[PDB]
Amino acid sequence: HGLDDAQYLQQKAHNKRISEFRSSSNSGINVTVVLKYTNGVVQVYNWQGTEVIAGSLNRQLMKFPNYMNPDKHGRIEWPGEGVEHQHGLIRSNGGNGSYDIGAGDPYAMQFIVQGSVDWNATRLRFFGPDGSRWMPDDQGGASVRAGLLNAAEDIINSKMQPLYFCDRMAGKSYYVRFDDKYAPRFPTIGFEVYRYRVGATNEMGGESARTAVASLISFPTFSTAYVNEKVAVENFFQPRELVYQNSYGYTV
Amino acid sequence: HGLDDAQYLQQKAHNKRISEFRSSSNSGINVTVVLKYTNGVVQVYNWQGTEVIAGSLNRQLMKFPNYMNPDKHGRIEWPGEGVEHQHGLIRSNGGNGSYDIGAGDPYAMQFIVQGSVDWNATRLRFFGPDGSRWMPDDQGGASVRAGLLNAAEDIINSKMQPLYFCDRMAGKSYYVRFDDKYAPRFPTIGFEVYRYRVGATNEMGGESARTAVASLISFPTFSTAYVNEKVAVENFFQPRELVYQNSYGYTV
Amino acid sequence: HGLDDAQYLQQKAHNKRISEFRSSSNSGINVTVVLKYTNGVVQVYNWQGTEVIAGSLNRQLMKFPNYMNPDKHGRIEWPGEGVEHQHGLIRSNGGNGSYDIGAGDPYAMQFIVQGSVDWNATRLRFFGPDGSRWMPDDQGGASVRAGLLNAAEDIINSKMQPLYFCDRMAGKSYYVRFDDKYAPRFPTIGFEVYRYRVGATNEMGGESARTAVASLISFPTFSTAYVNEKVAVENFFQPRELVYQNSYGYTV
Ligand SMILES: [Ca+2]
Ligand SMILES: [Ca+2]
Ligand SMILES: [Ca+2]
């Protein structure tokens, strides 16, 4: 030996570069919401950002199908799951002739965050279908006058599971069923995800103000619905090198 | 007496807490746009935020029905009120075969703001259907070169009416008809609503920059259309404890 | 002479006012995305702002028709260009029974920026249909782990063409074909456009923080599709006094 140490070192340097690039303030951080439906459908929403990733989904987008992702016949709503149905979710006994539970009302959600993220700072907020701040312990939803928009429970970091890519943790995932227990049965959501900083300089303000504000909405939001998780993982998540926990609790 | 002063005081403390919580920077502020249609339909858009609530509605969302709120048959546009119709609004005599005035073109709007808000700072901007800055006094719409994006008239605070919840003012409401007089006949809107601060520390910047920027889009926007105001008030506004002025000028 | 110098001077002062008003931090800056389709259709998206204009378009809005701009029959998708089609764009050979290239997949884009803009600071980012950061030189799309969200090539200022209104430059335009050469064949985009400042005070932060953040989303986004460029120019661009480069390279 050692006749190919230069090629080796070069590959080593390349690997180091890709793996550590995540900590760059100009790399991507990713927030993915995977909605799960009792017919096997999964609807993906994926946000990208550099310093801060924020967003939300109201019922119109929590449900399937919708104006963003029509079903295979170009329909954005289903019979029995249209306006009257939504009205019955907004207010108990406030609807009319519709299905009790929509086929297109998700039963669960996976929330995935990937990147060099300030994990502890992550906020995931649950609201009812009417935009009311939701509370655990059979407390129901809070009005606008009593509703705490930033609660201790929004910090979900400790409930999230570490997801590895090779030998390092790449991201964290949270799985929750919509059962009125640990989450609303017909929720809407808001979220905030923050860049982990390798220094003390505030890149959300000062000389960085103009780009910090712009970056909030200057990255397209990917979204689609897939016939099932298997297809979503092979055709989206894997090629993106987004980590994802499958139905069996495996990181894929 | 006084054998239940502890229960009394406790209820008193609870009431004080809910009523004053509104001034907390972590409470909710609410901005509601209620669009009114000549068929009795009201379309509600409700934004929530902590420090700053901003948003806008273009014609696609000013009209009914739309991709956000389809009619009872899953339709997002009506015959005679589709693309050619919109084209006739954008430019005088620029359309073709459509109704002169859409059933789904709103005739009026109520703008409601609720919370501990910096009332004087509120901005409501009117634009034409083509995004032109609209002007009063038969001046018409301004081009991009002459258009003032922040005008004295955007400060509508003095035209808004105080809306009480019990013995305190909870919010303010502005009612305007779309008649080319005090508002465009086919308007689009933009708005900015600001947290009233109980101190001098700028919570929109400095150490608060990261959360101030995130909070702009991290709360879901509620939206629906109701068959009439009566149903909207009993099934949405009242349970939310959002104040609202009805068709008779009454606070409900 | 000179019996009408007062009228002359007055017109002169008026002209000076309109022409220089663009440099006011309270004037408008405009960002227009014109998508071009092989059937002659052009779809316009026009953003307005004061200090910073940012936005993006995912495939749902890059394509025609969509939920924002339905075709003449109220349809938001076409046969053979619906969900399965989108799936074939997201992943090579990941779709099924659909047209190879949608009639509604744009073949080119004009990107126009107008106002007193910090021209050099302009960012236009290209992504693939799956939200992957796109690269030139047959390099393909980058994963989330390797993707550089702020690249040297996003600064397109030097590739843009000056567009005059009278004797001054009013804006700049960039024309690009979606051919996998200088742009993705099925792109999605994100952009950031910045106010040119006539002073050193940072109006994106400090005492200007609250309004800087709000202004990001407080101006409605105009959007429509026109049967062809000729109609779009006479009925939208010209009356708005937005400069625009036509199919012949002429400023109109
Ligand atoms: Ca308990
Ligand atoms: Ca007058
Ligand atoms: Ca080369």
Curated annotation (Swiss-Prot), chains A, B, C:
GO terms for cellular component: viral occlusion body. Keywords: Viral occlusion body. Coiled coil: none annotated. Signal peptide: none annotated. Major component of the virus occlusion bodies, which are large proteinaceous structures (polyhedra), that protect the virus from the outside environment for extended periods until they are ingested by insect larvae. This is Polyhedrin. It comes from Orgyia pseudotsugata cypovirus.
